[PDB]
Design a protein that fits this description.
The chain is an alpha+beta fold and about 325 residues long. Helix content is about 25%, strand content about 35%. The N and C termini lie far apart (about 85 Å). It binds chloride ion (2 copies) and zinc ion. May form homohexamers. Interacts with N protein.
Length: about 325
């Protein structure tokens, strides 16, 4: 006797594809790799309770390939398995509201994710993939599991792996609309003369080598090919924020002079991030944990500042 149930397959959890499945064959035999809200059911045979449920599958026909690209803006063939593998864990994390922002209770080396998430809620940024638009709206409301699993997938990180905040923000900015961001730099060498450069988009909002936006406006010393140090300084900025990054070093954060920052304690192989936000006072958000202080010093790695339009007075 042949028993069947109706189920729906999907790549985006919006467009559904009706299937009739044979209860005597695994999902994998019928669909390939198959997931039920992040759980791998490939090796499982259909259960009566599955009738009418939605299963994720891999994009295995042209209809699904188009739906997956339009939703996620990737064609990496391992993306949906990585997204589902992460979601099976992130759906069990907790997302407390801390000082009015969605955070993440510590689990699985997720500190870098927590500080990224907290940062996004303080800067003006809109995502391009519908998957991130939809998941980020859910995360602002407090249900951040899908957004966190998407960050893991986009960044090619698994649950439990040590991530870097700067690199994570780079990936997130790469799928955001920063097209009207522009940065003009001047590099002055006493031997070689001056060279201006213009940067756009993600490169216009990120700098690696100093935490201080004021120092970047005055000049920072960098190597020249002639062997002298040259001075690099900001000529013109058009963006709604800037991100200044450096290897971790002791640094003073002064109330009212930055938006938010990330602190890293540890070494190359293992460590822990915390988040500092400048509000009515300095709040230090460490996953679920919250403390306050009027002054702050620690091993800071990234600082975010508000911007709109800046033009140098340096001639
Ligand atoms: Cl968005
Ligand atoms: Cl600021
Ligand atoms: Zn030179």
């Amino acid at each position: 006797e042949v028993r069947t149930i109706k189920v729906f397959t999907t790549v985006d959890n919006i467009n559904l594809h009706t299937q009739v499945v044979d209860m005597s064959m695994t999902y994998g035999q019928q669909f390939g790799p198959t997931y039920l809200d992040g759980a791998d059911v490939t090796k499982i045979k259909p259960h009566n309770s599955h009738e009418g449920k939605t299963f994720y599958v891999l994009p295995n026909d042209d209809t699904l390939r188009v739906e997956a690209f339009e939703y996620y803006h990737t064609t990496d063939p391992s993306f949906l398995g990585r997204y589902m593998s992460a979601l099976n864990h992130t759906k069990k994390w907790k997302y407390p509201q801390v000082n009015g922002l969605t955070s993440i209770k510590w689990a699985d080396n997720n500190c870098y994710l927590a500080t990224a998430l907290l940062t996004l809620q303080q800067i003006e940024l809109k995502f391009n993939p519908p998957a991130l638009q939809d998941a980020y709206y859910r995360a602002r409301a407090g249900e951040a599991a899908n957004f966190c699993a998407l960050i893991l997938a986009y960044c090619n990180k698994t649950v439990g792996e040590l991530g870097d905040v700067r690199e994570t923000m780079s990936y997130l900015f790469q799928h955001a609309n920063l097209d009207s961001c522009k940065r003009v730099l001047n590099v002055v060498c006493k031997t070689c003369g001056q060279q201006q450069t213009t940067l756009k988009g993600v490169e216009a909002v990120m700098y690696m080598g100093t935490l201080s936006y004021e120092q970047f406006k005055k000049g920072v010393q960098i190597p020249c090919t002639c062997g002298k140090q040259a001075t690099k300084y900001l000529v013109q900025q058009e963006s709604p924020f800037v991100m200044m990054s450096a290897p971790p070093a002791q640094y003073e954060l002064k109330h009212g002079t930055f938006t938010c920052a990330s602190e890293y304690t540890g070494n190359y192989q293992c460590g822990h991030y915390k988040h500092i936000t400048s509000k009515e006072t300095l709040y230090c958000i460490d996953g679920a944990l919250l403390t306050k202080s009027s002054e702050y010093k620690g091993p800071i790695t990234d600082v975010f500042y508000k911007e709109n339009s800046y033009t140098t007075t340096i001639k």
